[PDB]
UniProtKB/Swiss-Prot annotation:
PTM (free text): Phosphorylated by FASTK; phosphorylation occurs after FAS ligation in FAS-mediated apoptosis and before DNA fragmentation.
Compartment(s): Nucleus; Cytoplasm; Cytoplasm, Stress granule
Disease implicated: Welander distal myopathy: An autosomal dominant disorder characterized by adult onset of distal muscle weakness predominantly affecting the distal long extensors of the hands, with slow progression to involve all small hand muscles and the lower legs. Skeletal muscle biopsy shows myopathic changes and prominent rimmed vacuoles. Rare homozygous patients showed earlier onset, faster progression, and proximal muscle involvement. Amyotrophic lateral sclerosis 26, with or without frontotemporal dementia: A form of amyotrophic lateral sclerosis, a neurodegenerative disorder affecting upper motor neurons in the brain and lower motor neurons in the brain stem and spinal cord, resulting in fatal paralysis. Sensory abnormalities are absent. The pathologic hallmarks of the disease include pallor of the corticospinal tract due to loss of motor neurons, presence of ubiquitin-positive inclusions within surviving motor neurons, and deposition of pathologic aggregates.
Positions of the RRM domain: 7-85, 115-186
Quaternary organization: Homooligomer; homooligomerization is induced by Zn(2+). Interacts with FASTK; the interactions leads to its phosphorylation. Interacts (via RRM1 and the C-terminal glutamine-rich (Q) sequence) with SNRPC/U1-C (via N-terminus); thereby facilitating spliceosomal U1 snRNP recruitment to 5' splice sites.
Domain note: The RNA recognition motif domains RRM 2 and RRM 3 are necessary and sufficient for binding to uridine-rich target pre-mRNA.
Protein's UniProt name: Cytotoxic granule associated RNA binding protein TIA1
Tissues of expression: Expressed in heart, small intestine, kidney, liver, lung, skeletal muscle, testes, pancreas, and ovary (at protein level).
Superkingdom to which the source organism belongs: Eukaryota
């Protein structure tokens, strides 16, 4: 049938009296077997204590593992464990380009020679000093160019790291009531 629904069970602790033929019969009522094999001695036909079974359907194998989970087959209880361990199919639980402010993502949004941050959203109180004092703890300032009338400013940093850091920190903050937005500028 479909290999996806075929399951291999690893059998162990087989009593020496047990043979390939025995597992076929023993496991058949619990699980439908396509084939079952005991690694047994060629001469005596006695089990070496282990083997494998191929079931036609997944439930059959699983049921058989449980029912034969140390069941008295032969003069002793045998062991079972699943060999073809069916993995569960995942889904996109993580990553699809998380939209947050990743410094790594932000720094790659511009060429490393660009040191300008575009600050927008500050329609009020927008002074050179206000931007300067805010941006300064994030990076070294070279220029502050402001336009309160248009509600934006250009913050010129000394370095690119400084500029990307400013964006990651300032983007989505609030300056005197106005929610600010920052990205790369010219």
């Amino acid at each position: 049938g479909a290999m996806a629904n075929h399951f291999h069970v690893f059998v162990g602790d087989l009593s020496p009296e047990i043979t390939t033929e025995d597992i076929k019969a023993a496991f058949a009522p619990f699980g439908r077997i396509s084939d079952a094999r005991v690694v047994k001695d060629m001469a005596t036909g006695k089990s070496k204590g282990y083997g494998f079974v191929s079931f036609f359907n997944k439930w059959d194998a699983e049921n058989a593992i449980q029912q034969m989970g140390g069941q008295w087959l032969g003069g002793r209880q045998i062991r079972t464990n699943w060999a073809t361990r069916k993995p569960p199919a995942p889904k996109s639980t993580y990553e699809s380009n998380t939209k947050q402010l990743s410094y790594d993502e932000v720094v790659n949004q511009s060429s490393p020679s660009n040191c300008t941050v575009y600050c927008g959203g500050v329609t009020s109180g927008l002074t050179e000093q206000l931007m300067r004092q805010t941006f300064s703890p994030f990076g070294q300032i070279m220029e502050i160019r402001v336009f309160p009338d248009k509600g934006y400013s250009f913050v010129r940093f000394n370095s690119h790291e400084s500029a990307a850091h400013a964006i990651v920190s300032v983007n989505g903050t609030t300056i005197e009531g106005h929610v600010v937005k920052c990205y790369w500028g010219k």
